[PDB]
């Protein structure tokens, strides 16, 4: 067996299930019933050549919904389940579709318009704004600019031009990883001034450009 296999047991039982459409508020109420172990009861009353189905809410949860039956003949509805154990099973076929009708559509609306208002309120602010004077206080410089100054003002700034040999070693070390590099990268990896890194690269190496002044330098590989 594998996770790509679909269990047909449900289908093999030919198990039928009911399909009911319900308004979000009723299911939201169920959503905050959590695990009370019920949300209501379903009542079915049958007569000669007629059937009446209805639902009653739990009185505790409230702190009559008639059902309208629906055609399913035009679609072969079925249900499958995607398990948290990553297992798939075909649970049953829809033998009936139906719609849960409100007890009153008319007065409800008062609540509904209010209901719509509660989910739907981007109170476009607009309340104008009278007259403001916060075109900002002007310090001596940007706060962050001072942060930038402080960073610049921490050790890094001047560079260690002294000791050519260690810098020579660093170039050799560059040559240990790859045959060519960007001079922008070469100053970054060496922490030395450009005019000097050039002065050295003139001494022990060569250069090679490509396309639009895109240049790389190499310690004369042989």
């Amino acid at each position: 067996a594998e996770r790509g296999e679909l269990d047909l047991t449900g289908a093999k039982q030919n198990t039928g299930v009911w399909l009911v459409k319900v308004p979000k508020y009723l299911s939201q109420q169920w959503a905050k019933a959590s695990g009370r172990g019920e949300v209501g009861k379903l009542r079915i009353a049958k007569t000669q050549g007629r059937t009446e189905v209805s639902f009653t809410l739990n009185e505790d949860l409230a702190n009559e919904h008639p059902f309208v039956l629906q055609s399913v003949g035009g679609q072969t509805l079925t249900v499958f389940t995607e398990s948290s154990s990553d297992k798939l099973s075909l649970e049953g076929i829809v033998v009936q579709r139906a719609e849960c009708r409100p007890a009153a559509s008319e007065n409800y609306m008062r609540l509904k318009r209010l209901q719509i208002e509660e989910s739907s309120k981007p109170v476009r602010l607009s309340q104008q704004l009278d007259k403001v004077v916060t075109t900002n206080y002007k310090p001596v410089a940007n706060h962050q600019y001072n942060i930038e100054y402080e960073r610049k003002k921490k050790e890094d700034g001047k560079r260690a031009r002294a000791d050519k040999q260690h810098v020579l070693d660093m170039l050799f070390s560059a040559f240990e990883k790859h045959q060519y590099y960007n001079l922008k990268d070469l100053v970054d990896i060496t922490k030395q001034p450009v005019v000097y890194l050039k002065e050295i690269l003139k001494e022990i190496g060569v250069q090679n450009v490509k396309g639009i002044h895109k240049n790389t330098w190499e310690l004369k590989p042989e």
Partner: protein
Amino acid sequence: RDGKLAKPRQLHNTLWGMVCPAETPEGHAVGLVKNLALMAYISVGSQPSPILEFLEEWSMENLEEISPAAIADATKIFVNGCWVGIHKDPEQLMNTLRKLRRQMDIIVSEVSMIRDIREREIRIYTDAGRICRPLLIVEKQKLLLKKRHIDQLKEREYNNYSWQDLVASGVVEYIDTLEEETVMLAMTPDDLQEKEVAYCSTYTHCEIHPSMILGVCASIIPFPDHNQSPRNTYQSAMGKQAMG
């Protein structure tokens, strides 16, 4: 502009009480520059969202949930020209929906709602930019507005009662040009009254006053109907031309 004869220059039939009949320039731009009617109003636009919720809750079935091979009998419903769904009982829906409009659960000035029976379509419009006008409602072959509403309007001289209250009685409605095609509209209370076998009895709206079809400048000109029609158009230009 400048060399092109056309039919969008000639006054069109639908411009009845929507755009002034005789108030467009006498130069080359004739009929292309029109002037709004006096009673005419223009929809400011609104979100379709509330209507979609009421419909789905009422009994509109969703598109991908239905079975295509079973829709021939059903009426297609559209909102802002977007095909939202289908319905198998459009007559109860239209009657109920208008009732909501009279009660203002959807904005009058906004929602236009039209049914094209011979095609089984229901178009609803809530986009900005539609030209519409106020009309009186008539019901059961007679006017729904009664003189008691008039006595409140006299009362306005010292009371908060207003034209908005009048719309809230649901005795007047707003009708855009697309919807105005499907109404049966009496010219004047007089005619809607005398009727027995005179013409018909199916009216649904009535005109608040027929001389309202004129635009701003055309209303200055007195007895405009005893004048030859282009004569009225020259006056609308010249009246606008006078000083004072």
